[PDB]
Amino acid sequence: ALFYGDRGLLSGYFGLGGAARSLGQGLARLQTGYLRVYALLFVLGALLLLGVMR
Amino acid sequence: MTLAILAVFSVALTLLGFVLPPQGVKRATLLGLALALASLLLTWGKPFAFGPYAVDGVSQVFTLLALLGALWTVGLVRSGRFEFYLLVLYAALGMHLLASTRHLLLMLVALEALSLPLYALATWRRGQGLEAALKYFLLGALAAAFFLYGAALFYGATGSLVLGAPGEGPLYALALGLLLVGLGFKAALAPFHFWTPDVYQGSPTPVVLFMATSVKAAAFAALLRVAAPPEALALLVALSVVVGNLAALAQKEAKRLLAYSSIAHAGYMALALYTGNAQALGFYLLTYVLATGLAFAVLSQISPDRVPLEALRGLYRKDPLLGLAFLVAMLSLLGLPPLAGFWGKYLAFAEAARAGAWGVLVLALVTSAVSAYYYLGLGLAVFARPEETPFRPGPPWARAAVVAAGVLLLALGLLPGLVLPALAAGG
Amino acid sequence: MVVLAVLLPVVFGALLLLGLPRALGVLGAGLSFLLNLYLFLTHPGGVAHAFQAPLLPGAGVYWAFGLDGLSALFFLTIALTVFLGALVARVEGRFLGLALLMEGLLLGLFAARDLLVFYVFFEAALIPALLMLYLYGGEGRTRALYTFVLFTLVGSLPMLAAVLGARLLSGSPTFLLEDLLAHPLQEEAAFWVFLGFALAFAIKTPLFPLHAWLPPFHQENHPSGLADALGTLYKVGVFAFFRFAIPLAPEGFAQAQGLLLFLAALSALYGAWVAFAAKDFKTLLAYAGLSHMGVAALGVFSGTPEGAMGGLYLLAASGVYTGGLFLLAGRLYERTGTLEIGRYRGLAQSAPGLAALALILFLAMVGLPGLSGFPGEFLTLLGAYKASPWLAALAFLSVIASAAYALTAFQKTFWEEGGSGVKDLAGAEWGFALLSVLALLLMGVFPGYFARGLHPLAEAFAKLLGG
Amino acid sequence: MALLGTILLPLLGFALLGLFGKRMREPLPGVLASGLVLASFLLGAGLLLSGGARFQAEWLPGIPFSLLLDNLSGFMLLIVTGVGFLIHVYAIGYMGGDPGYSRFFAYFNLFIAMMLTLVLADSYPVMFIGWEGVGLASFLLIGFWYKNPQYADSARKAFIVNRIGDLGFMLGMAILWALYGTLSISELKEAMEGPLKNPDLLALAGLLLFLGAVGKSAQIPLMVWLPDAMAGPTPVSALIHAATMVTAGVYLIARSSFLYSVLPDVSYAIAVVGLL
């Protein structure tokens, strides 16, 4: 049972790695390829920075 | 008086190309770049200012890096159009002017002078190359507008357009932010990163080499002049490195993946900006420029249009020296000991920790460990079984260039106490 | 001096990697062994061969080396283990050079007298291991590599911020351990620094939740297990804890001591127990190494110079005999063709002296008095009972499962009815066995002579946990 | 220094018969074994007639290597060596045409040396060393004929139960180290007379010592390992069930008689367990 539990623990570590990868591919999906999308995200990030500055 | 050499050679070759073969024009461009680099060496410890133009340790180191990247990227390009060399010369002079001044408006003029010829150099005429050039030009002109309004708000908050002026509160903060937007877009920092993957994927690999080395060098040189607030710096670093490495995880193409990795690396370099040591940053950028030029020279030897991940495999069996150098470059970009990329990373992190930014530094380190996934999926893939892939094993030109780059990387990783002593005034 | 012994395995491994032949690497590992032994003998003290050289004048980093009582015997231990792995290997794939390189790296790691150089060697040792894992065997090689490597790196990279905080927040001029200990950290900052140290030091120990990389690492290496032996020599977590983490930030360890002792206890028990359920040599030895590292960590975490010296001694000797068992499993693979425990039972009658050698090794593993394990095991028991008797007792429900899995494996591999018959012994295997048994017997019978340098360090760094 | 030879002789003999062993004729290993047992019996009886013996050598800090030969230690030594010589001769007889003559009598020498290490000890850690050595030699001799699975799992179970008892022994010893810090039976008795301290912890240490003794002498519940020693050859069963490996249980209590004499509940429990 403890052996199988250790196996499942290693599998959960794999699941965490895959969650990181999934997040990464969502962030890569953030780039659709439309210039309007890229420009909107750009202006958004710039306003976010200017607000953070205070 | 290196800028003088650059301008003289550019203007002369402009008309000379009418009577000279493009091969002769390429030889001439190479000679001029090497001569400017030699002058930079002989003027080591000779800071020289005439107007807003100022050559100091920063100017010297970063223009040395840019000249190296330009030499390497020119060596590979054999096109029979001397304009494809005129543009590189123009961009080199523009980046020198960018790194050698504090005047905001002259900085804008230098930015345009270096950026415009790259837009034209991004045209191999491949259909994706035009899309890349279009995204690049549009986002670049938008960022130029933002930087210009920031310079105006700087002139509003203070009587001069030169950085270092005392500065007001919220309005000065607003001016600093409007300058930082353009500077980070040019440095491929997120959330201004979207252009970088598309442009690296679309542009020809040697051009992308030129970009990812010289453009990033000059951009961080100009960034060091700004007094960026720590909260804004923290935000940029976090978003940049996180998004860079995460989205790089999902990338199936080497150039786009390397673009996201370069986003993460810009995020890393932005730490030295906390203190603006520029010795740490000079060293970091020396290492990163060498490694990236190496990697992109190999990618150019593979394919100029696009190189998939599997194309990298079997590179050791094809050329052992090339496979090994590509592995070394992947490790130096991962920032692992005993390599000079690790020393640059360590110096940036030391500057950051000295600035007292702990959570940001921790997040950067976590995302850097995340980067090891794809850094190893590239370096180790060299040993896999060669699949169907075009491979042209380079000239002795590119072979010796790649080998010398890797050798310099490892040597300055083992004994950084050789060059690092002279990234200041240069004793 | 020290640096010569540190560098000798590196240069010999290079001369095996690029140069020829394979055979020269055996005598190279032997020369490393001899010089490390010579430095171990006539050893005046920690300063014995002090070495200080400029590395990063501006940043404050210098090459700092010397043999403590700890560094001396660890030099000798690693030199010996890698020399055995060089002679008996039978890998001969030309990555015995990688093995010797990793040896020299481990020597420099132990010789590191300054924190940043210690850190540098700690991260550098990753590359040979990953290579001799990847290109010299294993089918799930890539995934085991990613698991092990990513675990080590996620643990390590925050420890760079921890060492930067340990140097900067204490106002230490350099990374020298002397200066860093001369400038101690205050409460609720030493807390975070010790936490950043303890993450990496526990994941490299390994402890219970963080051991999931150990079986994948051990399985997919070259079946001879030279890479496996060198990875078991890479379990320096206890050494780092005792030398750097606790002395540099004892305030956090004060709160975390109960948790750490408990984790060490559970690791020991869990490893020794699951090793029984293990059906293959790699997994069995992985869980065994986990249990031993758990015991060592318990001994260090108890305070208790008794327990601390016991943990350090158990660490060195367990590295030794675990690497020996790895090489033995690799040679039986090279002659038979399988690492399964059930098949090929008749070995005892067919194998004249492999039975006696494996028995000696497994007895040294289960912690039998007269062999290397028992001194450290008993000192750890004493110190753990001193610190937390409950956790000491729980951790020491380990000898039972240890004897269980060891005797089960030995019997089902050798004792039962004769099969076809097996190759007897190789000439290199003869020296391997002789020297292994010699070292095991000496470290079991005379734990007095060894660890004499360990006693002052143990009592001093345990009393450091007082007022 | 001379006292060490008593143990060394059926260790050098064991080493000869293990290493070369089969380079000898059939009777010669048994003859050597019995002769070393005899010329160790004699040389230990000479020391006993000389009044006693003591030996102290450098070992683990705070835990030296201490051997005490007194009336109580010599009684057990003479019993073991005499019965061992007799069973050695009987094994020379009983073992014939059987391969592993060398192995058998090397294991016999080892058993003799380990039992001597057990009984001749001024420190509980040396007592424990002898304990585990006797358990190992018992496992080995029970599994002498390895070609039969029946006579291997027997020895496995034996040693597992034995290591359970030995873990109890270790815990009691850690108690009588945390308490006093001597772990040498002589100075531990001299430190245990007078104002005893933490009587709960003292009774617990004595109870753990008794727990080990139960596993060794095959008392309840750990009895079950003894019958399957029939798996071993008959002279092995003789030596295990009569002269060695069980007598150590009583010897531990008799040496700890100072400890148990002040533990009425523990001594009553020992009596109850013996009756059952």
CSV table of C-alpha atoms in Angstrom, one decimal, chain C residues 156-455:
chain,number,residue,atom,x,y,z
C,156,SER,CA,18.2,24.8,-5.3
C,157,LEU,CA,17.4,28.1,-7.1
C,158,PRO,CA,15.7,29.7,-4.1
C,159,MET,CA,18.7,28.7,-1.9
C,160,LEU,CA,20.7,31.2,-4.0
C,161,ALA,CA,18.4,33.9,-2.6
C,162,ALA,CA,18.9,32.3,0.8
C,163,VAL,CA,22.7,32.5,0.5
C,164,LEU,CA,22.5,36.0,-0.8
C,165,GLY,CA,20.3,36.9,2.2
C,166,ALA,CA,22.7,35.0,4.5
C,167,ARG,CA,25.6,37.1,3.2
C,168,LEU,CA,24.0,40.5,2.8
C,169,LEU,CA,21.5,40.6,5.7
C,170,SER,CA,24.3,39.6,8.2
C,171,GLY,CA,26.7,42.2,6.8
C,172,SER,CA,29.2,39.4,5.9
C,173,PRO,CA,32.1,40.8,3.9
C,174,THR,CA,32.6,37.6,1.9
C,175,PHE,CA,31.2,34.1,1.4
C,176,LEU,CA,33.8,32.5,3.7
C,177,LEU,CA,32.1,30.2,6.2
C,178,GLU,CA,34.3,31.7,8.9
C,179,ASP,CA,33.0,35.2,8.3
C,180,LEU,CA,29.4,34.0,7.7
C,181,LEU,CA,29.4,32.2,11.1
C,182,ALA,CA,31.1,35.3,12.7
C,183,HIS,CA,28.0,37.3,11.6
C,184,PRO,CA,24.9,35.4,12.7
C,185,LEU,CA,21.4,36.2,11.4
C,186,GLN,CA,18.6,37.6,13.6
C,187,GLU,CA,15.1,36.2,14.2
C,188,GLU,CA,12.5,36.2,11.5
C,189,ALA,CA,15.3,36.6,8.9
C,190,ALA,CA,17.4,33.6,9.8
C,191,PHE,CA,13.9,32.0,9.7
C,192,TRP,CA,13.4,32.6,6.0
C,193,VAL,CA,17.1,31.9,5.2
C,194,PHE,CA,17.0,28.5,7.1
C,195,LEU,CA,13.7,27.8,5.3
C,196,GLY,CA,15.3,28.4,1.9
C,197,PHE,CA,18.2,26.2,3.0
C,198,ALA,CA,16.0,23.5,4.4
C,199,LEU,CA,13.9,23.1,1.2
C,200,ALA,CA,16.9,22.2,-0.9
C,201,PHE,CA,18.6,20.2,1.9
C,202,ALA,CA,15.5,18.1,2.5
C,203,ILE,CA,14.7,17.5,-1.2
C,204,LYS,CA,18.4,16.4,-1.6
C,205,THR,CA,18.4,14.4,1.7
C,206,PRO,CA,15.8,13.0,0.6
C,207,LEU,CA,12.9,13.1,3.0
C,208,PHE,CA,9.5,11.5,2.8
C,209,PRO,CA,7.5,13.8,0.5
C,210,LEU,CA,10.5,14.7,-1.6
C,211,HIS,CA,12.0,11.2,-2.3
C,212,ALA,CA,9.8,10.5,-5.3
C,213,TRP,CA,12.8,11.2,-7.6
C,214,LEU,CA,15.0,8.6,-6.0
C,215,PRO,CA,13.5,5.4,-7.5
C,216,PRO,CA,13.2,6.9,-11.0
C,217,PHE,CA,16.8,8.1,-10.8
C,218,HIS,CA,18.1,4.7,-9.7
C,219,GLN,CA,16.1,2.6,-12.1
C,220,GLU,CA,16.9,4.2,-15.5
C,221,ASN,CA,20.7,4.7,-15.1
C,222,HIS,CA,23.2,2.3,-16.8
C,223,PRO,CA,22.2,-1.1,-15.5
C,224,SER,CA,25.7,-1.5,-14.1
C,225,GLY,CA,24.7,1.2,-11.6
C,226,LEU,CA,27.9,3.4,-11.6
C,227,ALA,CA,25.6,6.4,-12.2
C,228,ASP,CA,23.4,5.0,-9.4
C,229,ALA,CA,26.4,4.8,-7.0
C,230,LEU,CA,27.5,8.3,-7.8
C,231,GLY,CA,23.9,9.6,-7.3
C,232,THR,CA,23.8,8.0,-3.9
C,233,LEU,CA,27.1,9.8,-3.1
C,234,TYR,CA,25.1,12.9,-4.1
C,235,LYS,CA,22.9,12.7,-1.0
C,236,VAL,CA,25.0,15.4,0.8
C,237,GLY,CA,21.8,16.9,2.3
C,238,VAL,CA,22.8,15.9,5.9
C,239,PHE,CA,26.3,17.4,5.4
C,240,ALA,CA,24.9,20.7,4.2
C,241,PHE,CA,22.3,20.8,7.0
C,242,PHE,CA,24.9,20.2,9.7
C,243,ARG,CA,27.7,22.4,8.3
C,244,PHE,CA,25.8,25.4,6.8
C,245,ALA,CA,22.0,25.4,7.4
C,246,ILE,CA,21.7,25.0,11.2
C,247,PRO,CA,24.9,26.9,12.1
C,248,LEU,CA,23.9,29.7,9.8
C,249,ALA,CA,20.2,30.0,11.0
C,250,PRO,CA,19.5,28.0,14.1
C,251,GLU,CA,16.5,30.0,15.1
C,252,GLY,CA,14.3,28.6,12.3
C,253,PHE,CA,15.7,25.1,13.0
C,254,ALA,CA,14.6,25.6,16.6
C,255,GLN,CA,10.9,25.7,15.6
C,256,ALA,CA,11.3,23.2,12.7
C,257,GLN,CA,13.2,20.6,14.8
C,258,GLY,CA,10.2,18.7,15.8
C,259,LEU,CA,8.9,18.6,12.2
C,260,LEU,CA,12.4,17.6,10.9
C,261,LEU,CA,12.9,14.8,13.4
C,262,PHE,CA,9.4,13.5,12.6
C,263,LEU,CA,10.1,13.7,8.8
C,264,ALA,CA,13.4,11.8,9.3
C,265,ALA,CA,11.7,9.2,11.4
C,266,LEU,CA,8.9,8.6,8.9
C,267,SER,CA,11.4,8.6,6.0
C,268,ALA,CA,13.5,5.9,7.6
C,269,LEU,CA,10.5,3.8,8.4
C,270,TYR,CA,8.8,4.3,5.1
C,271,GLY,CA,11.9,3.6,3.1
C,272,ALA,CA,12.8,0.4,5.0
C,273,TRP,CA,9.2,-0.7,4.8
C,274,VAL,CA,8.5,0.0,1.1
C,275,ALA,CA,11.8,-1.5,0.2
C,276,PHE,CA,10.2,-4.8,1.3
C,277,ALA,CA,7.5,-4.2,-1.2
C,278,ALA,CA,10.1,-3.4,-3.9
C,279,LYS,CA,10.4,-6.1,-6.5
C,280,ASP,CA,13.6,-4.9,-8.1
C,281,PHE,CA,17.1,-4.0,-7.0
C,282,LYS,CA,17.0,-0.4,-8.1
C,283,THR,CA,13.8,0.5,-6.2
C,284,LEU,CA,14.9,-1.6,-3.2
C,285,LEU,CA,18.2,0.2,-2.9
C,286,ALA,CA,16.5,3.5,-3.5
C,287,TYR,CA,14.1,3.0,-0.5
C,288,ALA,CA,17.0,1.7,1.5
C,289,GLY,CA,19.0,4.8,0.8
C,290,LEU,CA,15.9,6.8,1.7
C,291,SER,CA,15.7,5.1,5.1
C,292,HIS,CA,19.4,5.6,5.9
C,293,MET,CA,19.2,9.3,4.9
C,294,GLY,CA,16.2,9.5,7.2
C,295,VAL,CA,18.2,8.1,10.1
C,296,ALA,CA,21.1,10.4,9.4
C,297,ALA,CA,18.8,13.5,9.3
C,298,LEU,CA,17.2,12.3,12.5
C,299,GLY,CA,20.6,12.2,14.2
C,300,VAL,CA,21.6,15.6,13.0
C,301,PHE,CA,18.2,17.2,13.8
C,302,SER,CA,18.2,15.9,17.4
C,303,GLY,CA,21.0,18.3,18.3
C,304,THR,CA,22.9,15.8,20.5
C,305,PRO,CA,26.5,15.6,19.4
C,306,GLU,CA,26.1,11.9,19.7
C,307,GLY,CA,23.2,11.9,17.2
C,308,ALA,CA,25.1,14.4,14.9
C,309,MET,CA,28.3,12.4,14.7
C,310,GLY,CA,26.2,9.3,14.2
C,311,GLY,CA,24.4,10.9,11.3
C,312,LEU,CA,27.5,12.1,9.6
C,313,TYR,CA,29.3,8.8,10.0
C,314,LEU,CA,26.3,6.8,8.8
C,315,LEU,CA,26.1,9.2,5.8
C,316,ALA,CA,29.7,8.5,4.7
C,317,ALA,CA,29.5,4.7,5.3
C,318,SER,CA,26.0,4.3,3.7
C,319,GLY,CA,27.3,6.1,0.6
C,320,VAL,CA,30.2,3.6,0.5
C,321,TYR,CA,28.2,0.3,0.9
C,322,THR,CA,25.3,1.5,-1.2
C,323,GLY,CA,27.6,2.2,-4.1
C,324,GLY,CA,29.2,-1.2,-3.5
C,325,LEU,CA,25.8,-2.9,-3.7
C,326,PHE,CA,25.0,-0.9,-6.9
C,327,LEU,CA,28.2,-2.1,-8.6
C,328,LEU,CA,27.5,-5.6,-7.4
C,329,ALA,CA,24.0,-5.5,-8.9
C,330,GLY,CA,25.5,-4.1,-12.1
C,331,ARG,CA,28.0,-6.9,-12.4
C,332,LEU,CA,25.4,-9.6,-11.8
C,333,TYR,CA,23.4,-7.9,-14.5
C,334,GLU,CA,26.3,-8.0,-16.9
C,335,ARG,CA,26.8,-11.7,-16.4
C,336,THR,CA,23.1,-12.8,-16.2
C,337,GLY,CA,20.9,-10.3,-18.1
C,338,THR,CA,18.2,-9.3,-15.5
C,339,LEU,CA,17.9,-7.3,-12.3
C,340,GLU,CA,14.7,-9.1,-11.1
C,341,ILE,CA,14.9,-10.5,-7.6
C,342,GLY,CA,12.8,-13.7,-8.1
C,343,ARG,CA,14.4,-15.3,-11.1
C,344,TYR,CA,17.8,-17.1,-11.0
C,345,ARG,CA,17.6,-18.4,-7.5
C,346,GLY,CA,20.3,-21.1,-7.4
C,347,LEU,CA,23.1,-18.6,-7.2
C,348,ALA,CA,24.6,-19.6,-3.8
C,349,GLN,CA,26.0,-23.0,-5.0
C,350,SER,CA,27.0,-21.6,-8.4
C,351,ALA,CA,28.5,-18.4,-7.0
C,352,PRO,CA,31.3,-19.2,-4.6
C,353,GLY,CA,32.0,-15.7,-3.1
C,354,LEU,CA,29.3,-13.4,-4.5
C,355,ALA,CA,27.1,-14.9,-1.8
C,356,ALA,CA,29.5,-13.9,1.0
C,357,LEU,CA,30.1,-10.5,-0.5
C,358,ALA,CA,26.4,-9.6,-0.9
C,359,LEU,CA,25.8,-11.0,2.6
C,360,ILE,CA,28.5,-8.8,4.1
C,361,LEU,CA,27.1,-5.7,2.3
C,362,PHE,CA,23.5,-6.4,3.3
C,363,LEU,CA,24.5,-6.9,6.9
C,364,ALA,CA,26.4,-3.6,6.8
C,365,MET,CA,23.2,-2.1,5.4
C,366,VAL,CA,20.8,-3.5,8.0
C,367,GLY,CA,23.0,-2.0,10.7
C,368,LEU,CA,24.7,-5.0,12.2
C,369,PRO,CA,27.2,-4.3,14.9
C,370,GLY,CA,30.8,-4.9,13.7
C,371,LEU,CA,30.0,-3.2,10.3
C,372,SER,CA,30.0,0.4,9.3
C,373,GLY,CA,26.3,1.2,9.8
C,374,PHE,CA,25.8,0.4,13.5
C,375,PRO,CA,28.0,3.1,15.1
C,376,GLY,CA,26.2,5.9,13.4
C,377,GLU,CA,22.8,4.1,13.9
C,378,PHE,CA,23.4,3.8,17.6
C,379,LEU,CA,24.7,7.4,18.1
C,380,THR,CA,21.6,8.6,16.2
C,381,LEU,CA,19.4,6.5,18.4
C,382,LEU,CA,20.9,8.0,21.5
C,383,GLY,CA,20.6,11.6,20.2
C,384,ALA,CA,17.2,11.2,18.8
C,385,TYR,CA,16.0,9.6,22.1
C,386,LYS,CA,17.5,12.6,23.8
C,387,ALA,CA,15.7,15.1,21.6
C,388,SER,CA,12.4,13.3,21.0
C,389,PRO,CA,12.1,9.8,22.4
C,390,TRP,CA,8.8,9.2,20.6
C,391,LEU,CA,10.3,10.1,17.2
C,392,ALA,CA,13.4,8.1,18.0
C,393,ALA,CA,11.4,5.0,18.7
C,394,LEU,CA,9.2,5.5,15.6
C,395,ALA,CA,12.3,5.9,13.4
C,396,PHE,CA,13.8,2.8,14.8
C,397,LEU,CA,10.9,0.5,13.7
C,398,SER,CA,13.4,0.3,10.8
C,399,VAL,CA,15.9,-2.5,11.7
C,400,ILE,CA,13.0,-5.0,11.4
C,401,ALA,CA,11.9,-4.1,7.9
C,402,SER,CA,15.6,-3.6,7.0
C,403,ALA,CA,16.5,-7.2,8.0
C,404,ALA,CA,13.3,-8.3,6.4
C,405,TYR,CA,13.9,-6.9,2.9
C,406,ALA,CA,17.6,-7.6,2.9
C,407,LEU,CA,17.3,-11.3,3.9
C,408,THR,CA,14.4,-11.8,1.6
C,409,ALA,CA,16.3,-10.4,-1.4
C,410,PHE,CA,19.5,-12.3,-0.5
C,411,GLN,CA,17.7,-15.7,0.0
C,412,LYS,CA,15.5,-15.4,-3.1
C,413,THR,CA,18.5,-14.5,-5.2
C,414,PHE,CA,21.1,-17.0,-3.9
C,415,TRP,CA,20.0,-19.7,-1.5
C,416,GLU,CA,17.3,-21.7,-3.2
C,417,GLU,CA,17.5,-24.6,-5.6
C,418,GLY,CA,20.2,-24.5,-8.2
C,419,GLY,CA,19.3,-23.1,-11.6
C,420,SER,CA,21.6,-23.3,-14.6
C,421,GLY,CA,24.7,-21.9,-13.0
C,422,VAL,CA,26.4,-18.5,-13.1
C,423,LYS,CA,29.8,-17.0,-13.9
C,424,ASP,CA,32.0,-17.0,-10.8
C,425,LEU,CA,34.0,-13.8,-10.6
C,426,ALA,CA,36.0,-11.3,-12.6
C,427,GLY,CA,39.6,-10.2,-11.8
C,428,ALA,CA,38.5,-6.6,-11.2
C,429,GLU,CA,35.5,-7.9,-9.1
C,430,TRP,CA,38.1,-9.7,-6.9
C,431,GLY,CA,39.8,-6.5,-5.8
C,432,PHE,CA,36.4,-4.8,-5.6
C,433,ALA,CA,35.2,-7.4,-3.1
C,434,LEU,CA,38.5,-7.5,-1.1
C,435,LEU,CA,38.7,-3.7,-0.7
C,436,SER,CA,35.0,-3.3,0.0
C,437,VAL,CA,35.1,-5.9,2.8
C,438,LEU,CA,38.3,-4.4,4.2
C,439,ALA,CA,36.8,-0.9,4.4
C,440,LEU,CA,33.5,-2.2,5.9
C,441,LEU,CA,35.3,-4.2,8.5
C,442,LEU,CA,37.7,-1.4,9.4
C,443,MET,CA,34.9,1.2,9.7
C,444,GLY,CA,32.8,-1.2,11.7
C,445,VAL,CA,35.5,-2.3,14.2
C,446,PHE,CA,37.3,1.1,14.7
C,447,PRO,CA,34.7,3.9,14.6
C,448,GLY,CA,37.0,5.4,17.3
C,449,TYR,CA,39.9,6.3,14.9
C,450,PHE,CA,37.6,7.6,12.2
C,451,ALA,CA,35.2,10.4,13.3
C,452,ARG,CA,37.8,11.7,15.7
C,453,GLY,CA,37.7,14.9,13.6
C,454,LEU,CA,33.9,14.6,13.7
C,455,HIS,CA,33.6,14.7,17.5
